[PDB]
Amino acid sequence: GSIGQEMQMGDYYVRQLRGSAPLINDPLLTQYINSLGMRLVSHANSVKTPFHFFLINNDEINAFAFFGGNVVLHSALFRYSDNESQLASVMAHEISHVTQRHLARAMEDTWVGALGSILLAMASPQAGMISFTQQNEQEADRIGIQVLQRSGFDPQAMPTFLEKLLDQARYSSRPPEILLTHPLPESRLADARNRANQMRPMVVQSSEDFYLAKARTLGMYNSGRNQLTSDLLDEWAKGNVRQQRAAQYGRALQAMEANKYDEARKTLQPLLAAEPGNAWYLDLATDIDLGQNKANEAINRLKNARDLRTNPVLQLNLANAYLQGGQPQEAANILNRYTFNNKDDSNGWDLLAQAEAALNNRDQELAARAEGYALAGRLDQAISLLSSASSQVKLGSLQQARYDARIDQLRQLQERFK
Amino acid sequence: SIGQEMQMGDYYVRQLRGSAPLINDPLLTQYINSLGMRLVSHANSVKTPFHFFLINNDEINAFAFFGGNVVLHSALFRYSDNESQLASVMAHEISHVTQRHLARAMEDQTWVGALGSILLAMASPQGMISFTQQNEQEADRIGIQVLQRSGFDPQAMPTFLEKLLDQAEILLTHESRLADARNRANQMRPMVVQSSEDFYLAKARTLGMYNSGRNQLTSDLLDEWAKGNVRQQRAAQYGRALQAMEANKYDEARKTLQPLLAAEPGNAWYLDLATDIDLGQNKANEAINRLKNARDLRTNPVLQLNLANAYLQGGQPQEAANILNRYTFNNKDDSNGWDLLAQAEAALNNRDQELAARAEGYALAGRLDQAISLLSSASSQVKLGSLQQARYDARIDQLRQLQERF
Ligand SMILES: [Zn+2]
Numbered sequence: 001g002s003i004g005q006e007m008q009m010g011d012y013y014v015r016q017l018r019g020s021a022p023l024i025n026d027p028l029l030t031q032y033i034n035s036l037g038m039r040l041v042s043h044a045n046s047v048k049t050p051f052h053f054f055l056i057n058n059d060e061i062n063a064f065a066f067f068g069g070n071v072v073l074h075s076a077l078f079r080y081s082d083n084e085s086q087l088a089s090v091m092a093h094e095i096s097h098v099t100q101r102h103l104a105r106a107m108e109d110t111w112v113g114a115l116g117s118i119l120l121a122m123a124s125p126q127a128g129m130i131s132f133t134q135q136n137e138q139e140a141d142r143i144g145i146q147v148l149q150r151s152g153f154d155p156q157a158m159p160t161f162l163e164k165l166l167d168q169a170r171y172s173s174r175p176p177e178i179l180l181t182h183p184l185p186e187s188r189l190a191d192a193r194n195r196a197n198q199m200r201p202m203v204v205q206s207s208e209d210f211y212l213a214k215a216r217t218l219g220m221y222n223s224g225r226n227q228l229t230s231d232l233l234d235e236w237a238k239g240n241v242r243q244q245r246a247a248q249y250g251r252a253l254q255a256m257e258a259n260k261y262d263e264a265r266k267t268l269q270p271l272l273a274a275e276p277g278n279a280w281y282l283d284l285a286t287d288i289d290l291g292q293n294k295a296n297e298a299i300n301r302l303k304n305a306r307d308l309r310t311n312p313v314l315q316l317n318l319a320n321a322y323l324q325g326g327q328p329q330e331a332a333n334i335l336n337r338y339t340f341n342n343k344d345d346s347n348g349w350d351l352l353a354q355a356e357a358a359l360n361n362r363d364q365e366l367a368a369r370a371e372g373y374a375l376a377g378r379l380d381q382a383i384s385l386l387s388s389a390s391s392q393v394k395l396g397s398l399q400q401a402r403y404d405a406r407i408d409q410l411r412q413l414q415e416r417f418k
Numbered sequence: 419s420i421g422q423e424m425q426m427g428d429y430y431v432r433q434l435r436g437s438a439p440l441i442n443d444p445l446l447t448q449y450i451n452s453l454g455m456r457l458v459s460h461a462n463s464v465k466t467p468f469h470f471f472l473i474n475n476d477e478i479n480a481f482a483f484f485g486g487n488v489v490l491h492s493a494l495f496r497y498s499d500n501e502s503q504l505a506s507v508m509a510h511e512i513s514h515v516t517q518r519h520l521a522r523a524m525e526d527q528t529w530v531g532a533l534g535s536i537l538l539a540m541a542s543p544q545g546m547i548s549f550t551q552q553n554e555q556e557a558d559r560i561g562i563q564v565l566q567r568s569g570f571d572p573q574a575m576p577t578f579l580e581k582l583l584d585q586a587e588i589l590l591t592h593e594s595r596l597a598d599a600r601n602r603a604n605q606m607r608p609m610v611v612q613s614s615e616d617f618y619l620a621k622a623r624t625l626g627m628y629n630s631g632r633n634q635l636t637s638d639l640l641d642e643w644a645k646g647n648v649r650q651q652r653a654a655q656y657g658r659a660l661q662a663m664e665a666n667k668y669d670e671a672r673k674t675l676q677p678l679l680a681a682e683p684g685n686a687w688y689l690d691l692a693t694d695i696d697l698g699q700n701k702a703n704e705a706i707n708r709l710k711n712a713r714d715l716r717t718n719p720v721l722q723l724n725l726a727n728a729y730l731q732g733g734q735p736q737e738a739a740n741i742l743n744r745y746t747f748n749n750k751d752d753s754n755g756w757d758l759l760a761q762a763e764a765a766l767n768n769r770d771q772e773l774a775a776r777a778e779g780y781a782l783a784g785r786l787d788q789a790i791s792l793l794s795s796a797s798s799q800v801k802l803g804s805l806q807q808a809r810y811d812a813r814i815d816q817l818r819q820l821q822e823r824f
């Protein structure tokens with residue numbers, strides 16, 4: 001089965017990505033990027049596979065995708081994206097590469113590892129490299145702009161973003177890495193500007209989650225050219241009030257990053273007072289609270305949250321608060337259900353490992369950190385942890401049957417690829 | 419002619435008084451028109467007298483019509499950071515009238531009432547008019563000079579328009595035109611800018627006393643004003659005393675105003691609030707004596723209404739009438755004087771005089787038939803052939819002519 005092979009070929013590369021590339025595993029940022037991405041996929045034609053959207057800590061702008069609906073976005077995209085529709089146009093562009101099976105159809109002409117080595121070199125700040133035909137790039141722009149429009153974004157954002165890539169391709173000695181995987185001749189641009197001119201004029205406003213995502217990405221995961229500049233923060237202090245709340249949020253982050261917690265708490269207060277129930281400031285409200293060993297206050301606030309049952313960001317934030325507060329069992333009650341509902345989330349497993357370690361449930365601790373190692377492609381290491389777990393439980397027990405069964409599953413993943 | 423339009427203007431004004439939420443505050447209306455008036459005298463193409471009205475509406479809007487009657491929404495004060503920005507709106511709106519743009523627009527094509535219903539809908543918080551790109555490209559650039567000869571900031575207009583863009587109401591009735599506002603302001607001159615003492619207190623009383631929705635006098639602004647020039651610090655103290663009186667914190671209100679009144683005992687704003695605090699504590703005698711020693715007592719309309727009201731609460735309706743009888747003949751269109759005069763004549767048991775004063779209130783609010791009814795009642799209580807009967811019946815005649823025009 002091609003779709004079956006593609007989905008597990010994708011899982012193999014995604015596991016290699018987690019284990020060696022610097023992915024941003026932050027709950028707020030990953031939930032936003034996937035919520036935005038899924039909103040595009042839900043308006044794409046002939047989607048035959050699930051989709052996941054990954055974020056790299058890389059200041060070089062690039063974007064690419066491979067089998068299984070897995071698209072990779074560098075954090076530099078938030079530095080170049082002035083509006084949400086520009087970032088959406090890049091994801092729409094990459095989503096269309098997958099639906100058209102461009103990378104899959106290009107490979108029909110040691111080889112599984114040859115492609116995986118290319119994928120991580122493009123994602124790592126340590127950079128072979130894949131390239132699409134300019135015909136392929138035209139289909140991705142043609143199909144991407146229509147997904148862009150049906151999703152309620154500005155179609156003129158795609159040519160506007162392409163032109164900003166061209167103005168740095170000659171006003172700078174460095175060709176941005178995105179232009180080498182996705183080449184941009186003026187024909188590509190003039191074709192894009194023409195299509196946008198022929199759709200409906202639409203002025204769209206970037207969501208409030210976009211500016212907060214842009215602030216957290218550049219502020220909290222700053223790296224190289226990926227900074228949250230004071231020039232941009234002061235510029236956001238003059239724009240629409242969404243950018244001002246985002247600008248306030250960004251300085252609260254940097255005040256927390258520099259351990260000026262009371263300075264950060266007092267900056268964050270007015271935004272939390274206006275929106276007491278949104279996850280973005282709730283997330284940092286606990287972060288500053290635990291920075292001062294006020295874990296009870298973080299717990300009380302999160303138990304009063306409306307959407308604690310539905311929002312994973314809230315669920316992890318409270319589990320972490322229970323851990324720092326000295327109640328690991330309450331953290332485990334949340335995380336046992338959390339890890340079962342999000343088996344691919346390594347944040348959940350790592351926190352469960354912490355909770356089970358604090359409870360001195362060593363077999364369950366080893367099994368929890370085994371899942372972290374399995375998600376990172378460290379299957380030999382995951383098997384070692386579950387072997388140790390299975391050696392601490394009586395034979396014939398279900399814990400032994402379950403630990404040994406999980407080892408069996410990881411061995412099958414292992415033999416499918418060399 | 420100007421005659422029909424001035425009379426059409428009076429008809430639309432009467433309709434506004436009856437249905438739109440006008441701010442009839444003496445201090446605020448005296449300031450709104452005093453600033454308009456010397457701003458008016460710096461344009462020369464004016465055919466008509468000018469009156470400026472303030473509407474309690476938290477949605478920002480401004481418009482004008484026949485007879486030099488301009489309408490300003492109270493939301494204008496929270497958008498106006500300085501006196502020139504506030505006059506920038508008025509200079510733009512008076513320039514519409516002097517050049518006769520709205521009259522020009524309706525000469526192209528039941529109509530007079532349809533426009534009045536629209537004028538209320540814009541004014542009332544609970545269909546609109548819209549101007550072409552030239553029309554206000556006229557008004558703004560014709561209005562920036564009218565603002566400069568009056569000694570205010572020419573750059574005050576542009577900073578106001580940009581503060582409108584990033585929030586996308588005034589914008590339905592009013593980048594190309596905006597780029598021209600910054601285009602045209604930079605060329606003329608840069609100007610020293612200093613708001614009047616009255617602008618800061620007027621903004622304090624509008625946002626503090628007539629707070630409604632987005633029209634609040636926030637704890638962020640008056641903390642800021644306490645750090646400004648000495649005019650803004652006195653205004654910040656005035657606003658805090660005003661809000662304490664609004665919250666019926668009477669003792670705190672007296673002690674907050676005490677240093678301002680001690681420094682400026684003849685200031686009309688503080689003298690006014692000192693009466694409200696005195697009457698609020700049933701101390702009418704103290705409020706009366708303070709107002710009799712005010713320097714501008716028989717020249718300033720705000721002080722006269724304040725003392726007239728204090729005489730009523732103090733149990734001296736005759737002395738109140740002696741003031742108000744003269745006030746209503748000097749300020750015929752002031753409904754406050756007519757209402758206070760009706761209260762005094764009711765307390766003196768001069769019934770036909772009370773009905774006559776009440777009638778003027780209803781005539782100003784556009785209910786001419788009711789005013790005719792009350793005067794008819796007054797004329798029936800007075801002897802046929804008396805001078806009173808001749809006046810009452812003459813005023814009925816004047817009101818009937820008004821309603822026969824429309
Ligand atoms: Zn491409």
Ligand SMILES: [Zn+2]
Nearest residue numbers: 510554557592
């Ligand atoms: Zn206008």
